[PDB]
Each structure stands twice: as C-alpha cells, then as structure tokens.
Amino acid sequence: LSYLHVDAAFQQTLWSVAPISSAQGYLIGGDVLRLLHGECLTVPSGEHEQRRTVHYEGGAVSVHARSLWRLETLRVAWSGSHIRWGQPFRLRHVTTGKYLSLMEDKSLLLMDKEKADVKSTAFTFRSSKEKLKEVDGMGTSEIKYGDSVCFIQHIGTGLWLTYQSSIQRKAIMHHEGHMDDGLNLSRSQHEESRTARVIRSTVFLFNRFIRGLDA
Amino acid sequence: NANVVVRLLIRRPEGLLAAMEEAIKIAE
C-alpha cells in the first residue's frame, strides 16, 4: 500500500484477512432477493423523479430487473452467516444503488450513500408482530426462503411495514397495519444478480459520459 | 550468489542517468 494507490512493490505491507462464510434455501447474508407477498416490492421505472418513491405490487416486475434488493448486515466479518430474527440490514435497490432511505415522518425515499446510517435506514426481521447475540460462525439456519412468514420493524423509529389502500399499494410505516404484510422470499440466481450490477455500472458511466460531453 | 545478492538489493533500493549527468560538470 502506497501513500492509497495500491501496487506491487519492494516494501511489505501486512494484510489482516477476515472471513465471510464457508446449505440450500436459507437466508444467508448477502443475497440479492425479491420480497414476495402472496407480488413484490418495486421501484418506479425509468424513462419517466429519477426513481425515488416505492411501489408494491404484482405484475411482470417480479420476473424483471427493478425488484432486486440486497441485504448488508452490519458485521463486516462473517456477513455470510445465516440470518436470525433481529440482526439488522441496510437494504439497497441494486439497479440504481440507492439505499432504502427512510424518514417515517417524511416518506420512504431512495437517497444516496449519505443516508445509509445505522439508524436512518436499518431494518430487521421479527417473526411476530409483538414488540419483542453474536457468533462468528457460518451460521444457524434460521429462516428459509419458500416456507417463511417475515415481518419488519425499522430500528430508527420503531414503526412497522404495511401497505396502503401502475399500482401504488405503497408500503408505509405504521404501528399495527394490516395482517397480510406477509413477506415471503425468493432468491435471484447467479447471472440475474450479475446483470443487475452490470446495468448500474453502465449508467454510472453512461450518464457520466453524457454529462461530461455536454460541457 | 548472483541470485541472492540482487534479491537483497531490492528490499532496499539504494533517474540515475538523470542524476549522474547533472554532476558531470560539478566543480567547486
């Protein structure tokens, strides 16, 4: 490591390795996932905001690109463990990279990497809608994908996720809400996770291309 | 020995022709 331009040189530099992981169909931390209902959480399309509100509906978008969210558990080491009901995530819409930035008084927005604090956007999982802690291993297989009913309470305000009443059946923050906020899950496969980061890397260059030449 | 000395000559290094040209007229 030079002085911040990393390059192979004739001076040694220490390198403290840290692990991430080491079965089938369990919430292992780091997956890019749809968030099904029993219909899944979307973001409004482009060519029309720059995609900042949040819809929640069915359609072909659950087969399509925008409905893709990636958990990032706070532990840098061993983030590839399984997921138990209560360790937190900082969710992220992967096609644009914006975090699920929430102020429950204001709206359920999509801001940049500034609002991604441990409190401004962190959510968790709670198996009950009642109001009610570490290991450095590859995990205890708590949640599954197809057979799971999950519910989310924000850390920063304590409010709970329910839907309102081109469908804008919008997920909102409340105290009790409905009884059919029943988050079922589906993982996205290998290349579907791969294509999404390819699109985001293009737009962060192609819009960067277009803005520069128009000077 | 030709292998060993140069390996120990990279662990500390010490343009040379950019520097030794400037002293080629160095006097007083």
3-state secondary structure chain B: CHHHHHHCCCCCCCCHHHHCCHHHHCCC
Comparing C-alpha atoms, which of A94, A89, A90, A88 is closest to residue A43? A94
Comparing C-alpha atoms, which of A14, A19, A34 is closest to residue A188? A34
State the DSSP H helix or E strand holding residue A57, giving kind and residue range, or none if neither: strand A56-57
Q: In chain B, which residues have their Cβ closer than 8 Å to the Cβ of A10? A: 10-13
Instruction: Give the contacts of A44 (CB within 8 A, at least 6 positions apart).
Output: A51, A53, A55
Other CB atoms closer than 10 Å to residue B10's CB: what's the count?
10
Identity of the residue numbered A116:
A
Strand, helix or coil at A71? coil
Distance CA A167, CA A185 (A): 21
- For chain A, positions 2-21, list CB contacts with chain B under 8 A: 10
Q: Which residues pair with A89 in a beta bridge?
A: A123
Q: Is B11 on the interface with A (CB under 8 A)?
A: yes
For residue A12, the chain B residue with the least C-alpha distance is B11
Give the residue before each break in chain B, using a C-to-N cut-off of over 2.5 angstroms; say none if it is continuous.
14
Identity of the residue numbered B15:
G
Distance CA A204, CA A186 (A): 28
Here the tokens at position A210 are 């277009």
Q: Is B20 on the interface with A (CB under 8 A)?
A: no
Q: In chain A, which residues have their Cβ closer than 8 Å to the Cβ of B13? A: 10
Q: Which residues pair with A36 in a beta bridge?
A: A40, A184
For residue A10, the chain B residue with the least C-alpha distance is B11
Q: In chain A, which residues have their Cβ closer than 8 Å to the Cβ of B12? A: 10
Residues in chain B: 28
For chain B, the first-to-last Cα distance in angstroms comes to 41
Q: Is B10 on the interface with A (CB under 8 A)?
A: yes
Other CB atoms closer than 10 Å to residue A51's CB: what's the count?
16
- How big is the A-B interface in CB pairs under 8 Å? 4
Give the residue before each break in chain A, using a C-to-N cut-off of over 2.5 angstroms; say none if it is continuous.
3, 22, 38, 48, 132, 165
Strand, helix or coil at A209? helix
Distance CA B17, CA A149 (A): 73
